[PDB]
Design a binder for this molecule. Structure first.
Ligand code: ACP
Ligand code: ACP
Ligand code: F6P
Ligand code: F6P
Ligand code: F6P
Ligand code: F6P
Ligand code: MG
Ligand code: MG
Lengths: 431, 431
């Protein structure tokens, strides 16, 4: 005796009457601890695992109004040490409220945590709140890398609002020397034999993994081994306009219109003028995306995971038709566009689970052109631009427009490029 | 201008007119090199990557008729060394024919390869045939583990056909001591800095990964970190009989019949008499599997990936109806049941890609009960019992029967258990 939920179409038994994890970042400054923290979090939240970053740096920038210099981080700075410890403890406080009282699942503790003492303290914290502890250490003693990092995300930090490169660059170098003496890296073969951890070496050149307590830690591990930092570009766009677009019909597998092909031709000119040494092209298995890719005269690959969302019994229909034929359904979708699943079809949530492999592969690749569909494109875009599940189903991803995503600082930079070719508009807001 | 293939329903441009990899196993005997090789291969072939194992041991057992003793593996055994080298070279010969002439993609070289010399030779081989080289080393100096391994897959080997445990166990111990002196493990921080490799330590307790050249090596890495060897059991069965089963209609989302529920009740008694400390239950999101799981009064989890194959425009239909309504389609499926994809639906190939995450999770778990559907069940079973894509769509997976899969030696042992409850028969051979 079960009843099927109206929105998610899930069968639940009629009533009629996974321990949370604390990810601990470890490493000297300018080692990508925050970079990793944010990206990790962006991913986890995307695939549905509620994650939040707790940057002890911000707690510090909060308590000590405006920034001083490296003197603040001197081991002999008795007062700063007091404040820094109170920052770490305040953050763990907020962590407890997240994992135990706010429904959070993973809490990333973003700090240097370069001493066994500090780590043992966190372990204790976890041990008493019934939380698992997974460590991620970033080791890299390459002056070129450290130097480059200092330039990319430090010299512009709010701490150096009143500094130039020459001085900021020096203050941070001294800042790093502060942690160096007492820095005790993880020792998975001795003192840290029992800790579950992954040590990222030379920006992913080598990894040392210890244990792994569950699938969640398993994924995280997989992810870090696939992301990289080499500069590259990811272009995203939909198929050229198609017959169904003109008729305003959803789903289906129609072919490009006269304009759609025109757009496909423009896309070719665009890719051409991008001057990319290499470029991979991915499409869905639906006709319209393939016809578009063909116009590029470049080898491409088809992914069934990139097919537009499945509209179920509403495929081939027009919104008007749905509104009339399946009124109640048309309403259930407008009130919960993300979780709503079409009868015998999918939901935006289903797309995310279906696209996970695509995202993981995009992180591994260099330059990639993905020609897909509206809903599918929103999903991917929501990942790169960190858009909540609430706004995902409404992001604007118009026809004939190329979204150029480039890596910058801690996230992704986006550039819209309309290839100057008319087409209908398939976008529709909440109502 | 494209045309859609009739079987796979894929759009291809009308005509009208990934370097192969050699996986190198490394390690002393009784370290699971062959275990890993077979499992790795079983998996890769399942997800579509043509892989083959080249056990240098078999080449040896082939050339030297019947087995001697550990004297054969003595470093001072000038003649044996000659034969052993000719075996390794003959196997690489067959590797070349596989990766370059037989359409193979991955070739697992199963040997001790415990010396830098031997390894350099293989590198050279790869370097000249344009093959990538990925190494997997298994290090474990635990006497209990080594001892146990010697018992589980050595003492019964065809080499010891005329030996008892007491003597076989001793001959293998001496055999191991032979390789020990010249054994040079991988050194990812010195001599082997440039080699792409994964070093499995203490049966997966710790890993040291170096590089990783592509996604294929990325997956392999992920897999090894998720499989384990602790004893556990995996039960597989379909939902209890349902309305559609009675009407002989495919797809749909109907509920259990009177018998189906009866079966669900029997399943409860079965699980109960299994005396399992723990047991996870997974179902699909279709009503029939959930109703069945409910009868167990155990917490279960729903997976959309476990939903029966999507019959497309044929859902809810009876084979008779399909045969009549979509004759041409009914024929295209009987001639190629694995690759055939239903209009707007899936193929067995699609199921495999859809089930990959399930398989990966089953490898991570201990005891798991999976209540699914016919086609879905075949897919999973094909993985555990290593059944080709040709036989997969025809494996017999009857209603009300529990397949009990247990780990043994290098593969999985299967036991069928009919819970003694009538039901229709949904199996149908090729015709
Ligand atoms: N595994 C890694 N090793 C080294 N650098 C990395 C890295 N992952 C990312 N980066 C680089 O690090 C920079 C971001 O550094 P981030 O600010 O996250 O360091 P940090 O958190 O270690 C310093 P701090 O404790 O001083 O705030 C970017 O330039 C990024 O490309
Ligand atoms: N990573 C690992 N470390 C140690 N033992 C493992 C292992 N993976 C599997 N095993 C165990 O090893 C046994 C299979 O060993 P296998 O025969 O594959 O070893 P081997 O190939 O190293 C020996 P040889 O070169 O003498 O043939 C099984 O008992 C299995 O459970
Ligand atoms: O985590 P710890 O050991 O308290 O060091 C924290 C400090 O590190 C920094 O990231 C500087 O490297 C600061 O923003 C932060 O206050
Ligand atoms: O995401 P939305 O607003 O529900 O629109 C989804 C529809 O958009 C389309 O791509 C048409 O523009 C259809 O294929 C799909 O069903
Ligand atoms: O790979 P190597 O160095 O030639 O050693 C191969 C030998 O190892 C064995 O697996 C025994 O440990 C034999 O079956 C095989 O002939
Ligand atoms: O694998 P086959 O032989 O095509 O049968 C598949 C059908 O079996 C069923 O499970 C019915 O027994 C249907 O849901 C499914 O479409
Ligand atoms: Mg930081
Ligand atoms: Mg072997």
């Amino acid at each position: 005796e079960l009843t099927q939920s109206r929105v998610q179409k899930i069968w639940v038994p009629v009533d009629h009457r996974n321990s949370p994890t604390v990810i601990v970042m470890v490493g000297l400054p300018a080692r990508g601890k925050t970079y990793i923290s944010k990206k990790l979090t962006r991913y986890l939240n995307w695939i549905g695992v509620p994650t939040k970053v707790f940057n002890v740096g911000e707690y510090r920038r909060e308590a000590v109004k405006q920034y001083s210099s490296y003197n603040f981080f001197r081991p002999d700075n008795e007062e700063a040490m007091k404040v820094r410890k109170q920052c770490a403890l305040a953050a763990l406080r907020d962590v407890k409220s997240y994992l135990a009282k706010e429904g959070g699942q993973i809490a990333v503790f973003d700090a240097t945590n370069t001493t066994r003492e500090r780590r043992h303290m966190i372990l204790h914290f976890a041990k008493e709140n019934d939380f698992k502890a997974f460590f991620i250490e970033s080791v890299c003693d390459d002056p070129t890398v450290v130097a480059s990092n200092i330039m990319e995300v430090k010299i512009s930090s709010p701490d150096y609002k009143d500094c130039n490169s020459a001085e900021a660059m020096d203050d941070f170098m001294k800042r790093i020397s502060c942690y160096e003496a007492s820095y005790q890296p993880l020792d998975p073969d001795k003192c840290d034999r029992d800790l579950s951890l992954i040590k990222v070496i030379d920006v992913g050149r080598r990894f040392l993994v210890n244990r792994v307590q569950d699938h969640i830690q398993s994924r995280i591990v997989y992810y870090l081994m696939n992301i990289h930092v080499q500069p590259r570009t990811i272009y995203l766009c939909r198929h050229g306009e198609n017959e169904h677009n003109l008729q305003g019909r959803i789903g289906g597998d129609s072919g490009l219109s006269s304009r759609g092909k025109k757009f496909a031709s423009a896309l070719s000119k665009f890719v051409e003028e991008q001057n990319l040494k290499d470029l991979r092209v991915w499409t869905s298995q639906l006709k319209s995306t393939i016809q578009t890719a063909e116009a590029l005269r470049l080898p491409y690959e088809q992914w069934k995971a990139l097919n537009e969302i499945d509209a179920g019994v509403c495929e081939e229909l027009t919104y008007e038709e749905i509104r009339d034929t399946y009124p109640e359904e048309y309403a259930l979708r407008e009130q919960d566009k993300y979780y709503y699943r079409y009868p015998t079809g999918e939901s935006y949530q289903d797309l995310v689970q279906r696209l996970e492999p695509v995202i993981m592969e995009l992180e591994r690749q260099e330059n990639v052109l993905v020609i897909c569909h509206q809903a599918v494109l929103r999903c991917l875009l929501a990942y790169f631009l960190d858009k909540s599940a609430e706004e995902m189903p409404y992001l604007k991803c118009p026809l004939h427009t190329v979204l150029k995503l480039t890596p910058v600082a801690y996230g992704c930079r986006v550039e819209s490029i309309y290839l100057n070719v008319e087409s209908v508009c398939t976008h529709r807001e909440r109502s």
